[PDB]
Amino acid sequence: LDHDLSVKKQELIESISRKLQVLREARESLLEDVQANTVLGAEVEAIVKGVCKPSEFDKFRMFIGDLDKVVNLLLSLSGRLARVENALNNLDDGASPGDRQSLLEKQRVLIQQHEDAKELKENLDRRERIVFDILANYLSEESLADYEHFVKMKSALIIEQRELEDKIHLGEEQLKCLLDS
């Protein structure tokens, strides 16, 4: 029976390794995509500098910077919240009650921070509609479509990248732990 088990281990290892390979390829392709979207962004910025007065442009650049920062914030924050959540879940029964209470407190503070970040998302969207309405008058419709596509693509693409990175990291971890056997 030992043969069956060993070959089973080998099968699993090979499969997981394949998944890791395909995910890496996806990392490369997606990186090409981020490069392209970045170039489109630079183009939009160039076009807007000409038509937009200095205040409008400062609100624009400030807006995008705050976008990147906001997204990364929500992803890191949601990350720690998920980790603490799974820790509390799989935590052994009994052990220490003060530990369960401290972890619950971490859950509380993280969820509150999440609400604050939510309000921040609302305000940032307000800013987005503000810049959208102001810039709609200044620029053409085609370049405008390219702009909107770009802005949405930046955030969505950043998230896609980070989630993928998490998956590949995890797969690599389970693979390593399994090979150690």
Partner: protein, 55 residues
């Protein structure tokens, strides 16, 4: 070893401080602009009331 998590917390609160600061800036600029516009309008209508007053 688990201090890197604490570093993550610090990064989070950094993002908080930055975003709230930027928001405060846009708010101060917003109050100065809006106040200026109000001053303009009240000055205008006051001037209309003055032209009418000379009668």
């Amino acid at each position: 070893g688990q201090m890197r998590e604490l570093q993550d917390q610090l990064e989070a609160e950094q993002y908080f401080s930055t975003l709230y600061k930027t928001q405060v800036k846009e708010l101060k600029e917003e109050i100065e602009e809006k106040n200026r516009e109000n001053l303009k309008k009240i000055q205008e209508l006051q001037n209309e009331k003055e032209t009418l007053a000379t009668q």
